[PDB]
Design a protein around this ligand. Structure first.
Ligand SMILES: Nc1ncnc2c1ncn2[C@@H]1O[C@H](COP(=O)(O)OP(=O)(O)O)[C@@H](O)[C@H]1O
Ligand SMILES: Nc1ncnc2c1ncn2[C@@H]1O[C@H](COP(=O)(O)OP(=O)(O)O)[C@@H](O)[C@H]1O
Ligand SMILES: Nc1ncnc2c1ncn2[C@@H]1O[C@H](COP(=O)(O)OP(=O)(O)O)[C@@H](O)[C@H]1O
Ligand SMILES: [Mg+2]
Ligand SMILES: [Mg+2]
Lengths: 248, 378, 275, 239, 232, 253, 176
């Protein structure tokens, strides 16, 4: 076989270790982000919902990187923590040298370069962490970026990674109205997608985490929705489902 | 905080004095005080005072009336948990007063409320009360089902030593009622006895008595002496354990006279407990049957007086037992009251040949009927 | 003329395991489940017909070793009026590919011929592992054996009147196909005895033993040590043998305590740092 | 299962490190036994002194090494690795004295030894030192102390102990002895240690086959008992 | 997939770091440890059994302090725990020196998790075979985190690690109420140790530590004896 | 499984009952059909049903019946099976658990099974080789469709691969009705609620729930099963074994 | 102490209740007289004294049983007391689960004519799986003299022959 180490090339020319990591990224919990005309948002699923687990951070899957960036996570916990720490370090280093916020894509490219270096040099296992990026910059404004274990990123309007990523992405493609989504509509679509992306019915508020990026008076406030508004959105989706079934 | 403790002490003193009317007056006066205090504390205070009121032997007939007044007042004050606790205590009181039907209906009504609600300890207590009331009414299958549900709900929450002891004792009672496996009944009764001893509850002596009765029922009377003179059982020695010991000795010697003397002497400790009374009566019936069968083996036309003297029993009692035994396809024979004897024969088999012949006759009759159906075509 | 008709196991009338349900100490729930699944249907099929429920065809006892699974199997064998066949999972795995599945189908065909019958596959944990993408012939042989067993149990040719009993110790590494409601309807757990089943086991094992007045088995039952029924039987046998060694025909408290201390000791080395 | 016992940093399927256990077993290759008994005011250790050759120099074979005037050690197992660990322990004690002033307590001394062993076991660079390191020494405010701390990196406080081929038997004998609370005196401690070794080995214990080292509160300096003292203790033990 | 159960720097076809799972199994195969977080403080308890009466129960302590307001109990390989505790103390003191404020439980736990993960990225270094359980009282709110060899850290309200951890977790969620106090938390922790404890629970065999606002302190055999007698 | 039943009958019934339709259409008669899906979905049940309404020889072959020990016994057995099926033509050959023989082909060497490979090659030639079978349709049911080598799963040896997804809500209700026909249900036994309580039932777990409700009824010694009994049966038969170790579950954030 | 009490007084064993004393083991150095121990103890009874050393009883899987497990007890009963002597169990078929089932079968169910299995080679050590285990010490030099005397008896020697200093220079540690 040709998967003993990352450096080994298969005869067909495939980094088997990188493909294995990109397949394993599916074990991670579901996370998604919809880009809206007034902002972008992220949605994550708390796989661990045990009653004995105390929620102390409320941001297990959604981390703040800079004053105008945030990136969700999906993959190994240790790799995710290392990647988020490196992201913060890169963003603050760029701020110190240039004295302006990183234009999002710079941070994405830096992290992708780190991951590529890991997937190239021998003796290092590929970072099995695929993390969505959100943020606003003076050059392009709101953007959502996808990072894979192979360092291949890409601009995206709405994507989901982790469990049942294929179904969530497909039905986001089916019902995403380009250039006509507002943050409220974006949250509604995100809740609709998360409802069937996970097997758990009723989309418990404690089992879903949503963070939204907004551009208010030139501040770029990152807001993590409190349980109250999450419950309100869940109830709204339930009423919408009842209205839809009314046709039946 | 001081007021609650002072009221508890005053209620304890009054219950010592048996001033039930004064206790009710204090409860009604303090009614507003609960609104000025926390809900859980007020509910606990009301429950403690109500339990103290029922503890006194002053069963003047106003106990159920006071319980109903308290439950209605709690419903008025909108304390769901307090109302459920009061209903559970009322069900227990109905059991103690032997008004099972009302207790059964109230428990059935409250079971759904406790099932939807998350307070599973009161649910376990109420299910155990319903199982006990079902057993008291002879509905053993439903009682066992209720006890199984109670055990299932108990192995999902913290079962304090008292609740565990009650569950074990009730399930041992249910197992004993099903007179098929007495070893498990003894094991459950021992578990309940240990649980009660660790709490010093008065029901430890009852558990010990049931343990001794289970030991007796297994045709092993000798173990009673060892059990009574044990490390934990010694402190409970007294009239009740001695009565069980005497009954065990009587069963060991297998003498009906000793059993009757033991029952007559320790009437309070043996006939006032329904489980002990019923099971000891069944054991007495079994012992009498075995002794009578043993004493008629040599005889073929034994006169009733001699057999009664051999068994050391009244002539009428032995006559009735022999009649019942014959009427139930037990030892074969027929009595003749004209002079009095118990004739025994060998019960000719049945001559299966005649049964086969009759069955063949029926088959051929129906074949002739079929030929009647035929022959219609000429 | 036509001449009238043991083979592998075909437990014979003189080969009965000789263990009565009373000997099995304190397994009321498991006893009842095993009777409902493997014994009652053979006798009381009228209740199943009245409810029309197609009585369960397989039972999988799982739990810590020495808890009493094999004794329950033996008791069902001795208390049963149907042909009892006992096989061990290690037997199926053989060389000469085509003999494992061949023996499995031979056992099932034997059960079918003389029915009703009970097939006991003890330690089926050997050929029960979650079927993985086998990449070697030896790896694929065990999967073939498992496939043959699955096809025989719930397959095109329904057995009817044969019940399959299996005993393992993991119960979570088993192939999800075997634990399907149609092959192993009931999964009876055999937890290590608690303060109760321990007392019943002690009383049942000690019932035959001579014992002595000063020996109070309750002293040992309440001890917090977690010991299986096999451990209790070993403790009783060791206490009796210690009593016999000292030329004493009566077992006393000192011998029982010494035997209990000896049996409870199971750490061995443990190397002192794993813990 | 058995394919994971070729590297020290690879975990076994059940959660075990096989190489550490293998080194533990290798401890017994020397074929010797050592026992330590902690008395009320003394700490005594006795180890076998095997000289299976008339040309050997009995003075150069002693296994009792003095790490410091106040702390003592007896190496059991492989000779070369035991001597290397003894040298490392001497270095550790010297560095502790040089950096903190007060003499390093025995517990700390071979806790450092055990940390070195563990760092060896974690990073797969060197074979773990297959030699049990038994430490003794009087510690102010804590009386006599004997600490056994081994290749895998485990150190514990011991009232009595032993390392070598006959370790389980010696520890069982000590457990049978340590339980009858009695005056743990210097003479009593030495007698109990020698008796345990004699019963475990089932040998008459000629004076030239044993080597003893004792540290006492009255004289808190490692002393290696000579032949005369050992013989006197043995004669007292017999009668 | 037996071929990839050897190296920690290679990905299995399904995407499992096999060695990390094996290290977690080795951790779960160690000594029991249970900790409960009360509204007033935190409780940490581990069962300290030596193989014979010949071991000084007081020489090695499973519960050790990292700072004036951080604790540590483990379940697994003790020699690895010693290095873990040394690194935790160094990290806490580095944070104190740089910021002159006692390191918050969250940050010390995160840095300990980073230290753990440092060993699970290169061949030739065995993952830490011990899962730490950290107490704490920072900003007037009791904390309890568990750091694993995989590097992940959580905020356990109350959990039991090591041998018989399933039974301990089942016992929890039953006797645990979110509005307890330090004494009730200690009683619950002692009971949880009991349900997974073989033999008599002597004062020298069970080691516990309260970590309330006053700080982390290892209960001396006297207090443990009093508590066990009260429960017993 | 109405769609699945019709699809299977299109190959097992239509080609043999009315070959003239295919002769006129100008298409070759489909020969084989493969059933694959989650365990206990109803593949063997459909095979038995086809064996019922078949009016045609329905030779059965289990997973390990063609393995055999002596080399060349598997190939000979397959050849005799196909010769007998042709002699009794028309015929349907059901190969339950084709995963046993027919797995993905492995190289030589000690690891490879080899012999089962030879039997599978014999079967492959028989189903599509120099001699074309006439009036012999093969139904093979096997989970793990992806492991079968890409020669037995070629669109000439296996024409129709009918999937057997775990029954949906209406499918679960229909299965409950099918297996509860002979049961003594009690008024207020709404089966839609029970089906809603089974989100992803294998299909046979529905029968397991019915049997567990019947067993509860027997244990209580009644002859009617109530709704609470069905709910308990769902809670029992649908037991799931989670990780139970938060350490492993937290590895993947 | 292991084969005499069970043979002589089964009543005392049955009086106490513990019937099966079977098991036993003689792990130690290879062939230092292991068979002889089962021979010297054959002073009384031990008539058949069969040997099945690592062969015919499990054969890895079950290869040997009844016709290779019962036929044993068979003559082991149709005759005077005997010893199964399943010596060298460390070479059976060269499996552990079969052996565990091997030692927990009807073997102890009958235990005919007080026949005790005396396996000897190098949680299966508990009662019912393996009885008293004895480790044979390496031939003691003081015992080595005993061996040289008995072993060297038959060979025609002369009077000056001394079996005294040989052991001092002869510590081979093997009986052969
Ligand atoms: N309830 C019990 N009563 C008596 N002995 C028991 C009991 N449970 C276990 N034992 C002991 O263990 C044996 C049964 O354990 P077994 O079923 O063989 O365990 P396993 O199935 O794990 O092999 C008995 O022969 C006896 O030695
Ligand atoms: N769609 C369905 N309709 C009716 N019964 C079903 C259905 N799915 C599963 N079953 C039941 O589940 C059981 C599974 O048996 P089987 O057909 O052998 O499953 P599989 O095909 O997975 O091997 C059958 O007895 C059948 O009665
Ligand atoms: N202590 C001894 N006493 C008498 N003979 C011995 C002794 N040790 C070895 N022997 C000789 O060695 C042989 C015994 O070998 P044995 O121990 O049976 O080998 P194994 O253990 O492989 O069966 C006998 O021929 C015997 O003469
Ligand atoms: Mg077994
Ligand atoms: Mg099938």
């Amino acid at each position: 076989r040709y998967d003993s180490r990352t450096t080994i090339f298969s005869p067909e020319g495939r980094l088997y270790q990188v493909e294995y990591a990109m397949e394993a990224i599916g074990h991670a919990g579901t996370c998604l982000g919809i880009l809206a005309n007034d902002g972008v948002l992220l949605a994550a699923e708390r796989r661990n919902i045990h009653k004995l687990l105390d929620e102390v951070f409320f941001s297990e899957k959604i981390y703040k990187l800079n004053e105008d960036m945030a990136c969700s996570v999906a993959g190994i916990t240790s790799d995710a923590n290392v990647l988020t720490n490196e992201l913060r370090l890169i963003a603050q280093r760029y701020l110190l040298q240039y004295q302006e916020p990183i234009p999002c894509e710079q941070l994405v490219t830096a992290l992708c370069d780190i991951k590529q270096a890991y997937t190239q040099f021998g003796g290092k296992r590929p970072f099995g962490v695929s993390l969505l990026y959100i943020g606003w910059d003076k050059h392009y404004g709101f953007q959502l970026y996808q990072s894979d274990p192979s360092g291949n990123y890409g601009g995206w309007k709405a994507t989901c990674i982790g469990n049942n990523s294929a179904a969530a992405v497909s039905m986001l493609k089916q019902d995403y109205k380009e250039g006509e989504m507002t943050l409220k509509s974006a949250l509604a679509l995100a809740i609709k997608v998360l409802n069937k992306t996970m097997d758990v019915s009723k989309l418990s508020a404690e089992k879903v985490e949503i963070a939204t990026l907004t551009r208010e008076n030139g501040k770029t406030v990152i807001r993590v929705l409190k349980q109250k508004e999450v419950e309100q959105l869940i109830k709204k989706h339930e009423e919408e489902e009842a209205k839809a079934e009314r046709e039946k | 905080q001081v007021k609650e403790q002072s009221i508890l002490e005053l209620g304890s003193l009054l219950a010592k004095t048996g001033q039930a009317a004064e206790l009710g007056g204090l409860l009604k006066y303090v009614r507003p005080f609960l609104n000025s205090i926390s809900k859980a504390k007020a509910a606990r205070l009301v429950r403690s005072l109500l339990d103290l009121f029922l503890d006194m032997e002053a069963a003047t007939g106003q106990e159920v009336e006071l319980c109903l007044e308290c439950i209605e007042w709690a419903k008025s004050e909108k304390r769901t948990f307090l109302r459920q606790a009061l209903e559970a205590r009322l069900v227990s009181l109905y059991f103690d007063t032997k008004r099972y039907q009302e207790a059964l209906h109230l428990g059935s009504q409250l079971l759904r409320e406790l099932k939807k609600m998350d307070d599973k300890a009161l649910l376990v207590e109420v299910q155990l009360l319903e199982s006990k009331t079902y057993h008291a009414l002879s509905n053993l299958p439903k009682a066992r089902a209720a006890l199984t549900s109670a055990r299932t709900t108990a192995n999902a929450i913290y079962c304090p030593p008292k609740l565990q002891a009650t569950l074990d004792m009730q399930s041992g009672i249910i197992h004993a009622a099903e007179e098929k496996d007495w070893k498990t009944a003894y094991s459950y009764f021992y578990e309940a006895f240990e649980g009660y001893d660790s709490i010093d509850s008065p029901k430890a002596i009852t558990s010990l008595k049931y343990m001794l009765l289970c030991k007796i029922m297994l045709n092993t009377p000798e173990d009673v002496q060892a059990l009574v003179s044990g490390k934990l059982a010694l402190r409970y020695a007294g009239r009740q354990t001695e009565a069980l010991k005497c009954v065990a000795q009587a069963s060991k010697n297998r003498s009906l006279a000793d059993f009757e003397k033991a029952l007559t002497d320790y009437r309070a400790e043996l006939r006032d407990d329904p489980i002990i009374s019923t099971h000891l009566a069944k054991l007495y019936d079994n012992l009498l049957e075995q002794n009578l069968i043993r004493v008629i083996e040599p005889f073929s036309r034994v006169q009733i007086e001699h057999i009664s003297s051999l068994i050391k029993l009244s002539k009428a009692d032995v006559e009735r037992k022999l009649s019942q035994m014959i009427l139930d396809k037990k030892f074969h024979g027929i009595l003749d009251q004209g002079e009095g004897v118990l004739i025994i024969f060998d019960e000719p088999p049945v001559d299966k040949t005649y049964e086969a012949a009759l069955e063949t006759i029926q088959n051929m009759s129906k074949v002739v009927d079929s030929l009647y159906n035929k022959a219609k075509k000429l | 003329d036509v001449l009238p008709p043991s083979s592998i196991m075909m437990l014979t009338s003189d080969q009965k395991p000789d263990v009565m349900y009373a000997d099995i100490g304190g397994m009321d729930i498991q006893k009842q489940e095993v009777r409902e699944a493997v014994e009652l249907p053979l006798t009381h099929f009228e209740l199943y017909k009245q409810i029309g429920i197609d009585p369960p065809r397989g039972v999988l006892m799982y739990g810590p070793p020495g808890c009493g699974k094999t004794m329950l199997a033996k008791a069902v064998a001795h208390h049963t009026t149907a042909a009892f066949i006992r096989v061990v999972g290690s037997e199926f795995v053989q060389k000469y590919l085509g003999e494992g599945p061949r023996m499995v189908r031979d056992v099932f065909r034997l059960a079918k011929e003389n029915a009703p019958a009970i097939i006991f596959i003890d330690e089926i944990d050997a050929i029960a592992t979650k079927r993985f993408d086998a990449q070697t012939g030896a790896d694929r042989e065990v999967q073939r054996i498992l496939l043959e067993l699955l096809n025989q149990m719930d397959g095109f040719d329904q057995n009817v009147n044969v019940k399959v009993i299996m005993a393992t110790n993991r119960a979570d590494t088993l192939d999800p196909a075997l634990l399907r409601p149609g092959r192993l309807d009931r999964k009876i757990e055999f937890p290590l005895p608690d303060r109760r089943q321990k007392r019943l086991i002690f009383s049942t094992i000690t019932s035959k033993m001579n014992l002595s007045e000063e020996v109070d088995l309750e002293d040992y039952v309440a001890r917090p040590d977690k010991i299986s029924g096999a451990d209790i039987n070993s403790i009783c046998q060791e206490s009796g043998m210690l009593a016999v060694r000292e030329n004493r025909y009566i077992v006393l408290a000192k011998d029982f305590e010494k035997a209990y201390k000896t049996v409870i000791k199971k750490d061995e080395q443990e190397h002192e740092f794993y813990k | 299962s058995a394919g994971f016992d070729r590297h020290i940093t690879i975990f076994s399927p059940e959660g075990r490190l096989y190489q550490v256990e293998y080194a533990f077993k290798a401890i017994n290759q020397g074929g010797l036994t050592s026992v330590a008994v902690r008395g009320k005011d003394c700490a005594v250790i006795v180890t076998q002194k095997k000289v299976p050759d008339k040309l050997l120099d009995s003075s150069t074979v002693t296994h009792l090494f003095k790490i410091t005037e106040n702390i003592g050690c007896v190496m059991t197992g492989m000779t070369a690795d035991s001597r290397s660990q003894v040298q490392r322990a001497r270095y550790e004690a010297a560095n502790w004295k040089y950096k903190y002033g007060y003499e390093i307590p025995v517990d700390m001394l071979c806790k450092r030894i055990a940390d070195i062993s563990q760092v060896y076991t974690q990073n797969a660079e060197m074979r773990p030192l297959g030699c049990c390191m038994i430490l003794i020494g009087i510690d102010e405010e804590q009386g006599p102390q004997v600490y056994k701390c081994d290749p895998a990196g485990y150190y514990c406080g011991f009232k009595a102990t032993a390392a070598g081929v006959k370790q389980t038997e010696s520890t069982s004998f000590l457990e049978k002895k340590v339980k009858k609370k009695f005056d743990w005196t210097f003479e009593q401690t030495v007698e109990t240690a020698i008796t345990c070794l004699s019963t475990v080995l089932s040998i008459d214990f000629k004076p030239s086959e044993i080597e003893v080292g004792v540290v006492t509160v009255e004289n808190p300096k490692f002393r290696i008992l000579t032949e005369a003292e050992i013989d006197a203790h043995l004669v007292a033990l017999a009668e | 997939e037996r071929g990839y159960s050897f190296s920690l720097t290679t990905f299995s076809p399904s995407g499992k770091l096999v060695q990390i799972e094996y290290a977690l199994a080795a951790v779960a195969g160690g000594a029991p440890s249970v900790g409960i977080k009360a509204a007033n403080g935190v409780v940490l308890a581990t069962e300290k059994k030596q193989k014979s009466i010949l071991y000084d129960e007081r020489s090695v302590h499973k519960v050790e302090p990292i700072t004036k307001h951080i604790g540590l109990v483990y379940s697994g390989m003790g020699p690895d725990y010693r290095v873990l505790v040394h690194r935790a103390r160094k990290l806490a003191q580095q944070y104190y020196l740089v910021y002159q404020e006692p390191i918050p439980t969250a940050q010390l736990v995160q840095r300990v998790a980073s230290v753990m993960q440092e060993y699970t990225q290169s061949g030739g270094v065995r993952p830490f075979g011990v899962s730490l359980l950290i107490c704490g009282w920072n900003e007037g709110r009791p904390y309890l985190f568990q750091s694993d060899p995989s590097g992940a850290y959580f905020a356990w309200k109350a959990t039991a690690m090591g041998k018989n951890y399933v039974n301990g977790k089942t016992f929890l969620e039953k006797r645990y109420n979110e509005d307890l106090e330090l004494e009730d938390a200690i009683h619950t922790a002692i009971l949880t140790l009991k349900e997974s404890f073989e033999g008599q629970m002597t004062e020298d065999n069970i080691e516990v530590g309260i970590c309330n606002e006053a700080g982390f302190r290892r209960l001396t055999p006297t207090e443990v004896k009093d508590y066990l007698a009260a429960i017993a | 499984l109405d769609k699945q039943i019709k699809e299977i009958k299109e190959v097992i019934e239509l080609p043999v009952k009315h070959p003239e339709l295919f002769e006129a259409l100008g298409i070759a008669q489909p020969k084989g059909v493969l059933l694959y899906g989650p365990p206990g979905t109803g593949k063997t049940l459909l095979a038995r049903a086809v064996a019922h309404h078949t009016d045609c020889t329905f030779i059965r072959v289990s997973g390990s019946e063609l393995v055999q020990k002596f080399i060349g016994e598997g190939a000979r057995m397959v050849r005799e099976l196909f010769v007998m099926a042709r002699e009794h033509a028309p015929s349907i050959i059901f190969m339950d658990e084709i995963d046993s023989i027919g797995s993905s082909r492995l190289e030589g060497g000690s690891g490879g099974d080899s012999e089962v490979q030879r039997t599978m090659l014999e079967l492959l030639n028989q189903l599509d080789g120099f001699e074309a079978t006439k009036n012999i349709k093969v139904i093979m049911a096997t989970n793990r469709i992806d492991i079968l080598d890409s020669a037995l799963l070629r669109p000439g040896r296996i024409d129709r691969k009918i999937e057997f997804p775990p029954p949906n809500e209406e499918a679960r209700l229909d299965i409950l009705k099918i297996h509860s026909r002979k049961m003594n249900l009690t008024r207020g036994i709404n089966l839609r609620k029970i089906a809603e309580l089974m989100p992803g039932a294998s299909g046979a777990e529905v029968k397991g729930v019915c049997t567990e409700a019947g067993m509860y009824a027997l244990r209580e010694r009644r002859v009617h099963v109530t709704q609470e009994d069905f709910e308990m049966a769902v809670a029992k038969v649908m037991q799931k074994d989670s990780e139970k170790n938060m350490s492993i579950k937290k590895l993947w954030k | 102490e292991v084969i005499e009490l069970p043979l002589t007084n089964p009543e005392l064993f049955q009086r106490v209740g513990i019937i099966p004393p079977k098991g036993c083991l003689l792990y130690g150095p290879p062939g230092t007289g292991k068979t002889l121990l089962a021979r010297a103890v054959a002073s009384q009874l031990d008539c058949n004294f069969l040997k099945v050393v690592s062969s015919s009883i499990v054969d890895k899987y079950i290869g040997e049983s009844a016709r290779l497990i019962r036929e044993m007890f068979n003559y082991a009963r149709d005759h005077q007391p005997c010893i199964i002597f399943m010596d060298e169990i460390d070479a059976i078929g060269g499996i552990q689960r079969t052996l565990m089932e091997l030692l927990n079968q009807m073997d102890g169910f009958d235990t005919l004519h007080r026949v005790k299995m005396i396996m000897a080679t190098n949680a299966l050590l508990r009662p019912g799986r393996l009885d008293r285990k004895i480790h044979i010490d390496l031939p003691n030099e003081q015992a080595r003299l005993d061996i040289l005397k008995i072993h060297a008896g038959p060979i025609t020697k002369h009077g000056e022959i001394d079996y005294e200093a040989i052991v001092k220079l002869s510590d081979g540690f093997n009986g052969a």
